Amino acid sequence: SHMASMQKRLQKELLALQNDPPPGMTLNEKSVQNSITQWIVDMEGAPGTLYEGEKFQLLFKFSSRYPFKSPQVMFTGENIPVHPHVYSNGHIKLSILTEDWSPALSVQSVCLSIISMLSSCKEKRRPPDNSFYVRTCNKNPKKTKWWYH
Amino acid sequence: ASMQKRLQKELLALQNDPPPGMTLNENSITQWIVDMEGAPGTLYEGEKFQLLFKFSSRYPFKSPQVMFTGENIPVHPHVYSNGHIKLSILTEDWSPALSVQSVCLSIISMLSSCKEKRRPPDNSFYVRTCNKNPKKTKWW
Amino acid sequence: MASAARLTMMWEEVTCPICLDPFVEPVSIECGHSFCQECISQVGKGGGSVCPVCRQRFLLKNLRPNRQLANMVNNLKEISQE
Amino acid sequence: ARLTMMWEEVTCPICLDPFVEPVSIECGHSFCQECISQVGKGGGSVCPVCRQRFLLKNLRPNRQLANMVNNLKEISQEAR
Ligand SMILES: [Zn+2]
Ligand SMILES: [Zn+2]
Ligand SMILES: [Zn+2]
Ligand SMILES: [Zn+2]
Numbered sequence: 156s157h158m159a160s161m162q163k164r165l166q167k168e169l170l171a172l173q174n175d176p177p178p179g180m181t182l183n184e185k186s187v188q189n190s191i192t193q194w195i196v197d198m199e200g201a202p203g204t205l206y207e208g209e210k211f212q213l214l215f216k217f218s219s220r221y222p223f224k225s226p227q228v229m230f231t232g233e234n235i236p237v238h239p240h241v242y243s244n245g246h247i248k249l250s251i252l253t254e255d256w257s258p259a260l261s262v263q264s265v266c267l268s269i270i271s272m273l274s275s276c277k278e279k280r281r282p283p284d285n286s287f288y289v290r291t292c293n294k295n296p297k298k299t300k301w302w303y304h
Numbered sequence: 305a306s307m308q309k310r311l312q313k314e315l316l317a318l319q320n321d322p323p324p325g326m327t328l329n330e331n332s333i334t335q336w337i338v339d340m341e342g343a344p345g346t347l348y349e350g351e352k353f354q355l356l357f358k359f360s361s362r363y364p365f366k367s368p369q370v371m372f373t374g375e376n377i378p379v380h381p382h383v384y385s386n387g388h389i390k391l392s393i394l395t396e397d398w399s400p401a402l403s404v405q406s407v408c409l410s411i412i413s414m415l416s417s418c419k420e421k422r423r424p425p426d427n428s429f430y431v432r433t434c435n436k437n438p439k440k441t442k443w444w
Numbered sequence: 445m446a447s448a449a450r451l452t453m454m455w456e457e458v459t460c461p462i463c464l465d466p467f468v469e470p471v472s473i474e475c476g477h478s479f480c481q482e483c484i485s486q487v488g489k490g491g492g493s494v495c496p497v498c499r500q501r502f503l504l505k506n507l508r509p510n511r512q513l514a515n516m517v518n519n520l521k522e523i524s525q526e
Numbered sequence: 527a528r529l530t531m532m533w534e535e536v537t538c539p540i541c542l543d544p545f546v547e548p549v550s551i552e553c554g555h556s557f558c559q560e561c562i563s564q565v566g567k568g569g570g571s572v573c574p575v576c577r578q579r580f581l582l583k584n585l586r587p588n589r590q591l592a593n594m595v596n597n598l599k600e601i602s603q604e605a606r
Binding site (some may be wrong): 476477512 | 527528529532533535536548549550552553554555556576586587588589590591593594597598601
């Protein structure tokens, strides 16, 4: 039941992204695991910004309590933007993914915020804690996550 | 204005979509008359009656005065000789959320209520009560 | 017509029962029925009274704005200026 | 022509489906009873849209919204 209603919502959100994607974003459909828990969004940097011409990929991971808990969202692939709120390994520092999260937010709204964050940025710099944070992230054994619950 | 705005919306509703068995005759938005014909399956089929609606300045927060008029008055346990209608919705079950349309429907519901076409137990008494009164002459 | 009538269905559903106009500043009382702020307080002379629709007792201090209803009436005002 | 903007504004922002048993909270924002009670576990939390605080002690049914959603389901009931 929880997951039936969660699947219903997620299905409607995926239809909206395929039929009216935010500017510069596309969902990657060669990743078809019946789109019930993780999908990949191709995103291109915007003209006139520090990321003009760059092609990025966003990973969305939905837990069993979505939308009351926020999805996990990161950059992946091998082109990861250089940005003060994005780590080298692609993790993103954005509290709407944390304590400004509300269930009334959507994938669409998170996508717009990531886009707004890229083109708002005036300094192509990495986060000050980056080398620490990524060294600690390479020592944790989360390899097989059952993680959906 | 809000009251006249309401009354004109209600008046158009009556002229363009009257309740079943109803039609209105003779443009004076303080007082209007609705013709009513008896329905199939009730004891008043085929008879032609007329309803008078009187609206005061506090409408719709106070109830309109509603009565049967003409020389054809139905015989009904909740309807008097003089055309007065014994329906609590016209009195203290009145709410502004009630409408002319809803009052018309309640009367139709009442014509089809009764199993015996009878006069009210208070009928000769009650209309003798009202025949002495100073009357609402010019201003009220 | 092409469910142009469904347009009018939604108009009547956003009609205030007292003024019979689209809700203006719609508020809810305790029973959860909704009215124009100014119609329901025309009713409730004195601080409180009884719901026009269901007769539940209400107090004007317990008014609550119907943000969803206010939000939808203007989306329909926007749509019909075609 | 016709438009389905109609349906968007009778959609609960949590489940993204038409409101079922809609209730209002203190701020006056409306949600499905089941969705906002999921949000307000323990007797309270903050509004998903406005973040004003609320308690489910003061849930109030949105009767206008309940009646409208139901009526629109009827108009939209279609043979397949
Ligand atoms: Zn009103
Ligand atoms: Zn009520
Ligand atoms: Zn819901
Ligand atoms: Zn709110």
